[PDB]
Amino acid sequence: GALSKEILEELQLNTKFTEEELSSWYQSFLKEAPSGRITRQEFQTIYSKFFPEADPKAYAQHVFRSFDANSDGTLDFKEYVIALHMTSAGKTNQKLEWAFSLYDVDGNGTISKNEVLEIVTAIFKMISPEDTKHLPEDENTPEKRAEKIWGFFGKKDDDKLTEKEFIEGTLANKEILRLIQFEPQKVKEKL
């Protein structure tokens, strides 16, 4: 039950739970997943159930992959809790390192233009059509959003985006933060 300490020490301010509460959640988690592991498909099922207004399978896959760039295998309880926090709790500004891992689809250490499009598209599919019509014209399709992000970083099509640059830009340029925003409720709310 002391997988809770490293969850807390990894999330810190990000956390919505105490060690005791995490242990309670864990005990319940073990009743459904006694191995303490869940697969990509099982993780996707969680998002499919709780975002019925959206098409969350791609998003949930990228979130699952954020930790290791691997669609195979599993998350442990720690990674599952962190993932739910990342998509659903706290402030985007406390998640920037994790956001880099999300956007670096292949895990090679830099973000490419295509990776931005892939992730932006997956996030876009988390938005209901009823909300999409309220987006600014120049941010109302995945291609427009992804190209705006790339332009804000000053990039040519074949350039690579490093973690240093990503963190600087998402901190400093709040338009970049708005466009890379991956929490579905926050995209909805600033919209």
Ligand SMILES: [Ca+2]
């Ligand atoms: Ca990459």
